[model samples]
Target: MKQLEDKVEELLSKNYHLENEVARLRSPPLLVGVVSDILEDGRVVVKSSTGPKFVVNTSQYINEEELKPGARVALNQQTLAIVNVLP
Candidate 1:
């Protein structure tokens, strides 16, 4: 019974690892940037140090008051969504 329990735990661990791997593969990369502008409609334009600009909605991840110029944020590399507000 103990051996069976150990095997079960091992398989469960393997499953957990595989699940995380699949999630990582399906998820997009995260990019860091600073907010350059906030449009009147609540859209934010962020300028990255990597030389690309991204326009994303700010209402979901952060309050409009926090979307001011110079705010730091994280962006989804694929869909360009604002994922996080940085300190």
Candidate 2:
């Protein structure tokens, strides 16, 4: 049991490191869509990325990369918290 726990911990640590490296080496998240419409309810509706709409109520648009109407982007590239989220 102890050995299993240690192994799991080791793997978890390695995974975390790998993810960080990937985030740095890999291209930032592309902006697949532009900020089409912002509702008063704080819902940002975009039409580029095919996924569930995100209610990203950011206090500051610090690292928000702008996207033109026809521009393509990956979510991570434009994320302000990508590094913040990664350990």
Candidate 3:
């Protein structure tokens, strides 16, 4: 049963957002930087001035709050996004 569950989870993760994994960030994640530039695919680039190493395609999980020049945020590695406010 445990083996089956693991296998199922592996396949499921391919499409699912895997929110649980997002909640388990080691240390607080950084907001990086502003996404003033938009890629050809329409994905914006957020620089991680704090070394959060922000990733592309990952959801930033905007809390509707304005993004300042240097705002603190919690990084969600699962989705490669950050959290300014708890959902």
Candidate 4:
């Protein structure tokens, strides 16, 4: 039964790798930025590490209290919108 055990272990290893691939495929890429300023109209100014400042809107799901200047945030890779506030 040693051959059977080896096959089972190989299958389990492949399954684990496939699970990781699926997780990585499902997650969207995000950019990192620092909050520079907040606007009265609820838009936020963020400074990206790529060397440009952007005026982006924050997701309504995010906590407004955490949108302070100097706070680290995750940005949408395409739109540059503030997606989440980092802890």
Candidate 5:
């Protein structure tokens, strides 16, 4: 009976995490923007598809080579942070 109870507890824990993962996967999508300029201070200026300009910070994991003036990038919809450089 104790082993059966442990199995139930384990399954419940797994289910909870799986639910959280699914929620994360279904979260809001990122926005697409164009890099307008690369600042000397490491921040970048981007022009959103909506036609507004913004100075935003980039993710540290982003490849420096891919980030340049006029490059296409992905921006976080809420924070406007540069998340990834596009092709």
Candidate 6:
């Protein structure tokens, strides 16, 4: 029983370290925004709550077909690439 408890603690410690490392390496959360407009050229204008509007390639996001003005979208923090189209 003691050995099992020690092994569990060891595993938990390793998991904690791995979680921290992943967080450090991962990109920041996407920019929260609304789809301000959809261009005929397959580009989208996102109006970010944090700042001004920016254009993103429509193909970068999932559920691209469902995208429309007023739809919520998430953009990559650094690249401004469309990451997800929220329902």
1-87 per-residue lDDT for model 1 (tens digits): 999999999999999999999998998677888999988777788897578887776536467677778988888776667778789
Candidate 2's displacement at residue 56, Å, is 26
Q: If scored against the real structure, what TM-score would every candidate get?
A: 0.69, 0.32, 0.31, 0.74, 0.70, 0.68
lDDT by residue for model 2 (3-87), tens: 9999999999999999999889975454344455555664445544555444343324434343223333334434421121110
Residue by residue across 2-82, what tens digits does model 3's lDDT show?
999999989788546556556565355444344433456634445654554444553445633444334444444445454
Give all candidate RMSDs, comma-separated. Answer: 2.7, 9.9, 11.0, 3.1, 3.3, 3.8
In order of listing, the candidates' clash counts read 0, 10, 3, 0, 0, 0
Q: Candidate 5, which segments miss by more than 4 Å at Cα?
A: 1-25
Of models 4 and 6, which has the larger lDDT?
Answer: 4
Full ranking by lDDT: 4, 5, 6, 1, 3, 2
What's the C-alpha lDDT at position 47 in model 6? Answer: 92
Q: What's the CA error at residue 77 for candidate 1, in Å?
A: 1.0
Q: What C-alpha lDDT values do all the predictions have?
A: 0.81, 0.48, 0.49, 0.95, 0.93, 0.83
Candidate 2 lDDT score at position 9: 100
Top-TM-score candidate index: 4
Q: What is the lDDT of residue 72 in candidate 2?
A: 36
Where model 6 places Cα greater than 4 Å from the true spot, the runs are: 1-27, 59-61
Candidate 1: C-alpha RMSD to true structure equals 2.7
Better of 2 and 6 by lDDT: 6
> Candidate 5's residue-wise lDDT over 1-87, tens digit each?
999999999999999999999999999888999999999999999999978999998998998888988899999999899998888
Tens digit of per-residue lDDT, candidate 6, span 1-87? 999999999999999999999998884777888998888888889998788999877544377677888998888888677788887
Better of 3 and 4 by TM-score: 4
Q: Who is ahead in lDDT, 1 or 5? A: 5
Estimate the TM-score for candidate 4: 0.74
